[PDB]
């Protein structure tokens, strides 16, 4: 059954952990495994204590996220529908223990410097179970990169990568992300000028602008394979649809409107909505290092505005990728 924390996180590996993110689910750390950067997502399961305002999931309830993470990871090595635009999954383990002090140390440092919305994970007993997901390290989230991007040409590339990755997953898996806020879009430097994807056997390229995009956090995601659907049922969630203060929180309501609160169904319009939300962030809440005060750059801005203006008339990421003028 479960293994101790030390089996996953030996001393050196613990000692190198930096907290990089969080959610109601728990905690995400960066560290090094075998001279290689990785991200570790740690989720308490099976206990009766409240954690970050919700009850803990059972093993069964975490399975969808495992399954989805594996399917999306495997898209990097497929042929007919291939993308690197999600994130690699290296391993999954069930560990038992109280939270390691060194993780609490890193948790504390993040709380001091960025602030946390979570409870300090220091109340878990030595019998507590967790799922520990080890992912490829994908870079730095778009929200934290909001002042660091070169130009709207970089924004273009990012939108295109996002759209293509979502299209490929629609075509292969009937996938919806369902929570693609800008904290879930990672950016990593690359010296490849072009990135490659394949959609339904047809290969294409996207100019990278020096960046490679990774879509992460499949907590709310949905997909299906051979008529078996894997999804998170939020039909009875209340709090999810009553946020405000950001367009993010309208997306949850607009998804519910689109699917009539039936979360098993496939409504790839949800991917369109998130992409609309992300385009909105690109035009409003980003500061680019080069302003668009050249004609060429000003033309890119108009195309993105045109995208913002019209994309809600498309029915899926596939529709957008294949048909929207922004990508021609
Ligand atoms: O659920 C995930 N995070 C929640 C959002 O936190 C993003 C923090 N920054 C980061 C920054 C880099 N990485 N590299 C991989 C992940 C990650 N995360 C990752 C992979 C899978 C899931 C998640 C993260
Ligand atoms: Na990736």
From Swiss-Prot:
It comes from the Eukaryota. Changing residue 22 to A: Markedly reduced affinity for histone H3 and reduced histone H3 phosphorylation. Changing residue 181 to A: Strongly reduced enzyme activity, markedly reduced affinity for histone H3. The active site is at residue 179. Strongly expressed in testis. Also present in thymus and bone marrow and low levels observed in prostate, intestine, lung, spleen and lymph node. Expressed in fetal skin, liver, kidney and small intestine and also in proliferating but not non-proliferating cell lines. Changing residue 41 to A: Strongly reduced enzyme activity. Autophosphorylated on both serine and threonine residues. Strongly phosphorylated during mitosis but this does not appear to significantly affect its intrinsic kinase activity. Phosphorylation by AURKB is required for full activity toward histone H3 at 'Ser-3' in mitosis. Residues 14-328 form the Protein kinase domain. ATP binds at residues 20-28, 41, 136-141, 179-184, 217-219. It is found in: Nucleus; Chromosome; Cytoplasm, Cytoskeleton, Spindle. Belongs to the protein kinase superfamily. Ser/Thr protein kinase family. Haspin subfamily. Serine/threonine-protein kinase that phosphorylates histone H3 at 'Thr-3' (H3T3ph) during mitosis. May act through H3T3ph to both position and modulate activation of AURKB and other components of the chromosomal passenger complex (CPC) at centromeres to ensure proper chromatid cohesion, metaphase alignment and normal progression through the cell cycle. This is Serine/threonine-protein kinase haspin. It comes from Homo sapiens (Human). The lineage of its organism: Eukaryota, Metazoa, Chordata, Craniata, Vertebrata. The chain holds residues 471 to 798 of 798 of the full protein.
């Amino acid at each position: 059954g479960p293994v101790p924390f030390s089996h996953c996180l030996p001393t050196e590996k613990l000692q190198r952990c930096e907290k990089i993110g969080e959610g109601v689910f728990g905690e995400v750390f960066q560290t090094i495994a075998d001279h290689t950067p990785v991200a570790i997502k740690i989720i308490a399961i099976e206990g009766p204590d409240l954690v970050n305002g919700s009850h803990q999931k059972t093993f069964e309830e975490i399975l969808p996220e495992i399954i989805i993470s594996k399917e999306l990871s495997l898209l990097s090595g497929e042929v007919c529908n291939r993308t690197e635009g999600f994130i690699g999954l290296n391993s999954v383990h069930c560990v038992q223990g109280s939270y390691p002090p060194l993780l609490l140390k890193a948790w504390d440092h993040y709380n001091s410097t960025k602030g946390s919305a979570n409870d300090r994970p220091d109340f878990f007993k030595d019998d507590q179970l967790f799922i520990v997901l080890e992912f490829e390290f994908g870079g730095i989230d778009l929200e934290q990169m909001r002042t660091k991007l070169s130009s709207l040409a970089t924004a273009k590339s990012i939108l295109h990568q996002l759209t293509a990755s979502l299209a490929v997953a629609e075509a292969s898996l009937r996938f919806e992300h369902r929570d693609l806020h800008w904290g879930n879009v990672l950016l990593k430097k690359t010296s490849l000028k072009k990135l490659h994807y394949t959609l339904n056997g047809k290969s294409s390229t996207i100019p990278s602008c020096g960046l490679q995009v990774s879509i992460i956090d499949y907590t709310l995601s949905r997909l299906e394979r051979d008529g078996i659907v894997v999804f998170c049922d939020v039909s009875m969630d209340e709090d999810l649809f009553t946020g405000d203060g950001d367009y993010q929180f309208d997306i949850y309501r607009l998804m519910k409107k689109e699917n009539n609160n039936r979360w098993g169904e496939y409504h790839p319009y949800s991917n369109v909505l998130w992409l609309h939300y992300l385009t909105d962030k690109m035009l409003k809440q980003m500061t680019f290092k080069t302003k668009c005060n050249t004609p060429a750059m000003k033309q890119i801005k108009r195309k993105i505005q045109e995208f913002h203006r019209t994309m809600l008339n498309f029915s899926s990421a596939t529709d957008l990728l294949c048909q929207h003028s922004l990508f021609k």
